[PDB]
Design a binder for this molecule. Structure first.
Ligand SMILES: [Mg+2]
Ligand SMILES: [Mg+2]
Ligand SMILES: [Mg+2]
Ligand SMILES: [Mg+2]
Ligand SMILES: [Mg+2]
Ligand SMILES: [Mg+2]
Lengths: 194, 194, 194
C-alpha cells in the first residue's frame, strides 16, 4: 500500500527490535534509517523475499487448515503507551493469540524443523507484537511448499514473556529518546545556522 | 536445457568438488544445497558469467585451431562406481584426453598467464573429470578475446593424478554418505511425526 | 559520452587517488583495472549512484544561488607534467577555484554536516584536481534535496595544500611507473613466446 508505509514511517517496528537490542552497528544503522525517515518524510526503497511474501497467504491458509483457529488480518498496531513504536502481526488468532508467518529459503525452514525454535530475533519480534497488542501467545509458523507434504508446515507456540517485554520496552524507550533528541539537535543547529 | 538440470539434480559435480574437500562453511553450504535439491526435486535459480558462457565456443574453436585435436562434446558423465557423482568436461579430446575451458575476467586470465597454473579448485575439478571418464589428461584452456592476439589464449596440460583422485573419491564418498543419511533422517522424523 | 570514457581510459584519475595511496588491496585492484584497460582498449561496465548523478546539476545551481560565483563546466584536465594522470572537477569557479559536488545518501550528507569535513579520500581527490588545474581552492558541496531546506546544502572550502600535492604526485608517479612496466613486461613475454 501507500498507507502501509505511512503507518510505519519513522517508527520502531517489531521486525527491527532485534537491531535495537543487539550487543552494535545494527543499532546505529537502524537509528540512522529512522532519523532520515523522520527528517525527509520518506523511506528508501530479492527473489526469495518476494517469493516469500507471495506465499504467506498459502501459509496462513495452511495454519487454519491445521488448527481450525479464527484468524483476522490486522495492520500496524501502535504500542499502547510508547509513542513511535508498533507491530504488525500476520494475524489475530482467537481472542488472545497471534500468528507470525515465515516463508523462507528451504534450508532455513529445515533448520527450524531441526531445532524446533524460532531465531532469537523472531522471539523479540513476537514478544513485541504481544507487547503492542496485549495478546497472550503467538504461533510461529514456518512454511515451504517446495518440500514433501510432511515437511512443508511447522508451527510452535511462543507464550507472552513479561520480563522480556519489560526489557524490550526499556531498550526501545531509550532508543526512541536518542532518536528524537538527535532530530531535535540537528534541527536546532540548522535553524540557528540559517 | 531442462535435461541439463535434470542430469545434475542432487549430485555432487566436478565443479563443486573443491567445496566438498576444503579445510569449512563451503562444505556444509553445498551439503545444504544438495539436501534441498533431493527433497524438493528442484534447484534454486552475472554479466561476467554470462559473457563467459557465451564465449566458450570461441575458446573451443581457438583450442582446435591451436592444436588440431578432435573434440567431441559430452554432457554429464556419471562416476563409474560412485552413485550421485558426475562430471561435465567441456569436451572429449582424442581417445584419452579432455578440455576444460575458462572465459573469465581479463585480470584472472592475466594472472593465469603469469603463474602458468590453474587454481587448485580447478585441479580438483579436472582430476574429478578424469575420475569420471577414465581419461588420462585434461588440457586447461583460459581464453579472453578482449586482449591482444598474443595474450588471448592459454593452455596447459594436467595429467591424471591417481593419488589425488583416490583422495577425492574418499571425500566425496564420505560427503555423499552424510547427505543420504541426512535425507533419510529428516524423512524418518517427518514420517514418524505425521 | 563515449568521449568521456575515451579521455579517461588507462589513466589514474583524481577520484581514485585514495586507492593509489592507501596503506593495500585497493591499490593493487586499481592497478589491475588500469592494466586491463590499457591492454584491452576498453573499460568494464546503483539506484543511489544514478539518483546522485542526476541531482548534481541541481546541486551546481544551488551552489551558484548561494554564492553568486561564475561556474564553468570542464571535462578531463590532464596533469601538466605527469602523463596518464588527470582530474575531472565538477566546475571551474572564478579564476582560481573549483567545485566538487557530492549527492550521496541522506545519512552520509547528515554526517558531513555533523563533522563539517569531507572524507579523507575526497581531500585527496580535490588536492589532485588542484594539482591538475593549477587552482588555489575547491569548494566541496554536499547536497540532498530530500531534507528540510535548512539541511539540504553544505559547502566548505578546501585550500590548495602543496605538501599533500607533492606527496600525491610522488605516489602517483611510482604507481604509473609500475603500471607501465607491468604492461611492458607482459607484452615482452607474450611477444617472445609467440
Ligand atoms: Mg509480521
Ligand atoms: Mg511474517
Ligand atoms: Mg566444465
Ligand atoms: Mg568450463
Ligand atoms: Mg568530479
Ligand atoms: Mg562529484
Amino acid at each position: 500500500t501507500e498507507e502501509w508505509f505511512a503507518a510505519r514511517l519513522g517508527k520502531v517496528t517489531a521486525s527491527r527490535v532485534a537491531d535495537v537490542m543487539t550487543k552494535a552497528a545494527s543499532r546505529q544503522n537502524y537509528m540512522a534509517e529512522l532519523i532520515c525517515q523522520r527528517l525527509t518524510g520518506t523511506q528508501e526503497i530479492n527473489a526469495a523475499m518476494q517469493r516469500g511474501t507471495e506465499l504467506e497467504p498459502h501459509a496462513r491458509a495452511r495454519y487454519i487448515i491445521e488448527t481450525g483457529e479464527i484468524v483476522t488480518e490486522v495492520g500496524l498496531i501502535d504500542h499502547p503507551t510508547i509513542a513511535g513504536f508498533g507491530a504488525s502481526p500476520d494475524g489475530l488468532v482467537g481472542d488472545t493469540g497471534l500468528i507470525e508467518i515465515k516463508c523462507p529459503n528451504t534450508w532455513t525452514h529445515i533448520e527450524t524443523i531441526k531445532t524446533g525454535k524460532p531465531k532469537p530475533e523472531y522471539i523479540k519480534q513476537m514478544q513485541t507484537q504481544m507487547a503492542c497488542t496485549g495478546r497472550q501467545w503467538c504461533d510461529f509458523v514456518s512454511y515451504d511448499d517446495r518440500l514433501p507434504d510432511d515437511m512443508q508446515y511447522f508451527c510452535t507456540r511462543i507464550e507472552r514473556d513479561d520480563a522480556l517485554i519489560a526489557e524490550i520496552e526499556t531498550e526501545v524507550s531509550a532508543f526512541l529518546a536518542e532518536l528524537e533528541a538527535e532530530i531535535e539537535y540537528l534541527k536546532r543547529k540548522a535553524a540557528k545556522l540559517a
